[PDB]
Amino acid sequence: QSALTQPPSASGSPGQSVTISCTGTSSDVGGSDSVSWYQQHPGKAPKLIIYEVSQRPSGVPNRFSGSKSGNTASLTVSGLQAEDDADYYCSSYGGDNNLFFGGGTKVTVLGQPKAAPSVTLFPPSSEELQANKATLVCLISDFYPGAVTVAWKADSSPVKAGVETTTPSKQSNNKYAASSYLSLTPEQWKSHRSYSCQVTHEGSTVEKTVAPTEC
Amino acid sequence: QSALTQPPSASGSPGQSVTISCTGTSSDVGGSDSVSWYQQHPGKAPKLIIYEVSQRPSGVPNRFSGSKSGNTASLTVSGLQAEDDADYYCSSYGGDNNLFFGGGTKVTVLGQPKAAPSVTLFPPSSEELQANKATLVCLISDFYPGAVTVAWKADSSPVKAGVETTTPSKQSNNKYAASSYLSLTPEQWKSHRSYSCQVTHEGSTVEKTVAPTECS
C-alpha cells in the first residue's frame, strides 16, 4: 500500500541490535542517496534521525546508523534502550520532485516474553445470515509485542474492501488481543470456495480458512 | 531539535471550518516554501496532506488548504467531516539539512452522532472444537461514542470468569469496534442450553444468544 516497503515490526531486548529495511525501486531508493529515517513515539511529534542515507542530525546518538544497498536502505539501532521503542518510517526522493514514504516499522523493546497469537476464525453465524449479513471474524489473542498485521484472502485473491481490524489492546493477562472482521454479503460468502485470515506477528504468518457448509 | 509551534487543540462542528497555525523562524518556515502538513489518526500511520506550503498530494480532498505568511504556516480544513478528527503535524526544512516538526494539533470534530452497536455473536467454530477449544466471540461494531460494557450469560446465569473485552478502537467508518470473547471448554459449551452476550451502550442493552448447533 505504501510506496516504499518496510517490515511491519521488529523487536529486541535491551542492549540488543535491530536492523529494519526500506525497499523501493531504482527510481527512488536506488536512484540517489536521499533516504531519510524518522522516529515517532505514538501520539508525539516525529523526529528526523537519518538523512541522506547515513547522516545523523545533531543530538542523535551514533547507536543509529543508516546504510543502503541497491534498492534497499537499512537503519540499524545498536544497543537498544527503552527510549528506542517507537515507530520508524523511511522516505526517499522519487523520480521527479516526488517524496515517497514507507509504511512504518513498530520497534518494540521487549518488556515481557514474546508470545505468538492464538488465531480463531469464525464463519457466519446463523442469525446474521438470516439478516442478510455474512460477516467473518478472526479473533487474535494472547500475543506480545502488541503489533500484528492481518490479511484476508477470498479463495487465493487478496480482499481489501470490507476489512476492519481493531487496534490491539492489552487484556487482563497482560497480553494483547484484537479482532479482524470481513463484512461479506451472503452471496459473496456462498459463492467462493473459502475465505482465509492471515495473521502476521514477529515476522511469522499464521493462516486460518473457513468455507460454507450446508447447515 | 527545537520545535515548530502549533496549538495543542482545535475544533469545529460538522460542515464548519477550522484553521490551525504553525509558527517557525525566518530560517525554517520563513526561509523557503518547504512547509508540509500531515494527518494522523491515533494508532495509524500518518498521511501527508500538504507539501510545499500549498500543494495537495493525489487523493487529498480540496477541503484542505495550506498557506504561509512570514514565519507562520496555516492549514484550513473546510467542510469538516468525522474523518478529519485526528492529529495534524506541520514540518519545515531549515538550513544545515535540518527538519523541524511542530508539536501537533489535535483537531476535534464536535457533536458527532450517537450510534447504537451492531452485535454479532459467534458460536465455536468447527476447527477449535476439534482442537478441544470452545471460544465464543461477541463482535461489537458501528457504535459511538466508544464506550461499552459487556456481560455474558450461561443459560440465564451470569458468567463471572473467562471473559475478555478489547478496548474499543475507531474504524474506517469513524465508529468504534470491539470484541468480547469467552473461553469455554467444549464441555461447558455442550452442557448448557445457550450462551448470551449482553452489550450495554449509553444505557441501552443489546442481547444475542447462541446454542450448540444441531447440524452434522
Ligand SMILES: Cc1cc(OC[C@@H](C)c2ccccc2)cc(=O)n1CCOC(=O)NCc1cccc(-c2c[nH]cn2)c1
Ligand atoms: C506511511 C506514510 C508516512 C508518512 O510519514 C511522514 C513523516 C514525516 C511523519 C511521521 C510521523 C508522524 C507524522 C509524519 C507520510 C505519508 O504520507 N505516509 C503515507 C504514504 O502513502 C503512500 O505511500 N501512498 C501512495 C503514494 C504513491 C505515490 C506517490 C505518493 C505521494 C506523492 N506525494 C505524496 N505522496 C503516494
